[PDB]
């Protein structure tokens, strides 16, 4: 039937269509998403981070520390 209304059938089902592919969509956008929240993340780990550099900090203030114990 070449002659059949090729328009959209406006009276269609506009609902949610429960049978849609619920999988992961492996072809997506794997990039940086530049419009992402550029803020401080208040819920970050406020603890001590035990696995931190326990070394000597070779670049530290080698000066005289003028505010030191001036007593015996």
């Amino acid at each position, epitope marked *: 039937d*070449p*002659n*059949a*209304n*090729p*328009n959209v059938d406006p009276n269609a089902n506009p609902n949610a269509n429960p049978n849609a592919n619920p999988n992961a969509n492996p072809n997506a956008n794997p990039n940086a998403n530049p419009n992402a929240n550029p803020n401080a993340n208040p819920n970050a780990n406020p603890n001590a981070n035990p696995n931190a550099n326990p070394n000597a900090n070779p670049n530290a203030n080698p000066n005289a520390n003028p505010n030191a114990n001036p007593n015996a």
Partner: nanobody
Framework: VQLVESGGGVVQPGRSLTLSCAAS????????MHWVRQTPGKGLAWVAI????????YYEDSVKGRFTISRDNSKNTLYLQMNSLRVDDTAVYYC????????????????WGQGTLVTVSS
């Protein structure tokens, strides 16, 4: 409401030429489209029809197997690619829009483009 064709020119017989057709001023994704040729000395002649999705296509018996019609709803464009052009295809190609109808039988062609001249000669 504007429908503009493009991509015309002059090619040798046996070559392949593709055409374009841009729609503006109305939602293009909601209309099926036709391509109609106009050969000087003859009346309008239907070529191909696209079913609003590319899901169904139908061609004239004279161009079956050599003509491809496809649409890009994201850019509001039509594509009628012509393969193995012959001298008898020398005509002006118009885009036609099927008007909305409240039935299951379709309706006439509402909007027509200005058309582009495609000629084949040696």
């Amino acid at each position: 409401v504007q429908l503009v064709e493009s991509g015309g020119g002059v090619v040798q017989p046996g070559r392949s030429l593709t055409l374009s057709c841009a729609a503006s001023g109305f939602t293009f994704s909601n209309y099926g489209m036709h391509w109609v040729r106009q050969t000087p000395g003859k009346g309008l002649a239907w070529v191909a029809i696209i079913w609003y999705d590319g899901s169904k296509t139908y061609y004239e018996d004279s161009v079956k197997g050599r003509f491809t019609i496809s649409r890009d709803n994201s850019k509001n464009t039509l594509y009628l690619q012509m393969n193995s052009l012959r001298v008898d295809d020398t005509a002006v190609y118009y885009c036609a829009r099927v008007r909305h109808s409240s039935s299951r039988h379709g309706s006439a062609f509402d909007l027509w483009g200005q058309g582009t001249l495609v000629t084949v000669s040696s």
